[PDB]
Design a binder for these strands. Sequence first.
DNA 1: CGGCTCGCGCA
DNA 2: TGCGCGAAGCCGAT
Length: 456
Amino acid sequence: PRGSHMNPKRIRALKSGKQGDGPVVYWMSRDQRAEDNWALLFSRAIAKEANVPVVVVFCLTDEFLEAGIRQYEFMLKGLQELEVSLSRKKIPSFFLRGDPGEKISRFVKDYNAGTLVTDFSPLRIKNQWIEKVISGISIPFFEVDAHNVVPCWEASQKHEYAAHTFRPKLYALLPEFLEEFPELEPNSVTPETLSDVLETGVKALLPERALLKNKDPLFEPWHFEPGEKAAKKVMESFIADRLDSYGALRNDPTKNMLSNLSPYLHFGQISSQRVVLEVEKAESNPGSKKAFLDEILIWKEISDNFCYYNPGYDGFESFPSWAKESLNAHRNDVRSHIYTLEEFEAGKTHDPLWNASQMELLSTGKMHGYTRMYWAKKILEWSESPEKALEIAICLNDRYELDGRDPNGYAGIAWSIGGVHDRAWGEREVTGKIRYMSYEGCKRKFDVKLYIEKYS
DNA sequence: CGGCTCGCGCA
DNA sequence: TGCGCGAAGCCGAT
Ligand SMILES: Cc1cc2nc3c(=O)[nH]c(=O)nc-3n(C[C@H](O)[C@H](O)[C@H](O)COP(=O)(O)OP(=O)(O)OC[C@H]3O[C@@H](n4cnc5c(N)ncnc54)[C@H](O)[C@@H]3O)c2cc1C
């Protein structure tokens, strides 16, 4: 609609209709932040043109029961901060409970909303909620990509087989879509308790908590401070202290040399566009700069591409034909070990390097990026079938990772087990032509003994 | 046809 | 640790 610094390719219409006379409602789901949020900015530009206020509506679902307290507290504390941030901009935030397909349509009718705006997510349940809302509303319904630097429907029109095909496409659109962010103007016009939704939710998740032997929780909640502000300092400390050595030590789990931005990036507490803008300006190691930019741009946004064009992104059917044929041929092969879900969960395998990886996931909620590949590939090696390996890897990833339930997860798991965005390797038993990792290969890359001792 | 985000042998 | 090769199937630039 209008705005000089607003690219119209970031916004697409889910439903046409007659503009209402009420405020513009932003259905915040994925990008939980006030700054550097295209969905909140575009909602504001429309409200300014229509001479109406803009309000933010957030629907708390029953989805937190599937996960644990570690993600629930991380999200809820971030929203408590966001409530204060929007209040200073004179933007009232409403927090609802229940099915978004029923609650959002009721709010748009109760509040007499004029236009509805939401952010983009390629997940299945988001597309289901939007279709339920479309049938219930009569006002226009727009969608804005505030997560990806290049809007997902613009970067490619089909499923990308590999990164070397997606890389030229994305880097060619960077001069257009890589731009600064204008400030969020405060509202000229005017018009549940999160402290209750937090206490009610923790009392429900308390039985499912991950514990020790003498009933002491394994999760250490002091490693990552949640919120928009703390995410800014994590990115600042990375670019100043850790980015120079990122290209050389990103695969060393004994060195805390990663950006640690994924939990904030998953919940939308910081914009990846903002991080790219600051890394692009920083004068650091040219090899390290390109290595990081390939992670936050190519591999992050191609994961949205994978989920957005493959609805069965968490299933065996999404695997490439060569991988499905190979894994099918080795279904009857004898496995060296067979472990259940509970044995993987408690870290009681024969491999101490795998066990230490699970210990890092249970204690900190963020396992080092290199060991995540070794972690998932050994699940496939020591399971009944490729389907049970996929089920277990997704279950443990979504239950204990702060960045779980994310397109980066289902794409990263499909890469590990189904060879998605990968290629074929030497033929083996059980795994077939899926890329193989070994305990001995990690020994010649990093001090395995230190990583094992660090996590029992 | 050339090139893709492991293990392996050898400085 | 850093390099160069090997084993593998397929995209896509023509
Ligand atoms: C088995 C497995 C499961 C995964 N599950 C998840 C998950 O649930 N949630 C999640 O956010 N990521 C997941 N990924 C990707 C990866 O684990 C994380 O992006 C990263 O390890 C988080 O640490 P970091 O942000 O400090 O890494 P950094 O090296 O600092 O990466 C910077 C950013 O680049 C992106 N990125 C990096 N590596 C990848 C990758 N392989 N694929 C896609 N994007 C990437 C992320 O946005 C990340 O925040 C998984 C990877 C594997 C191998």
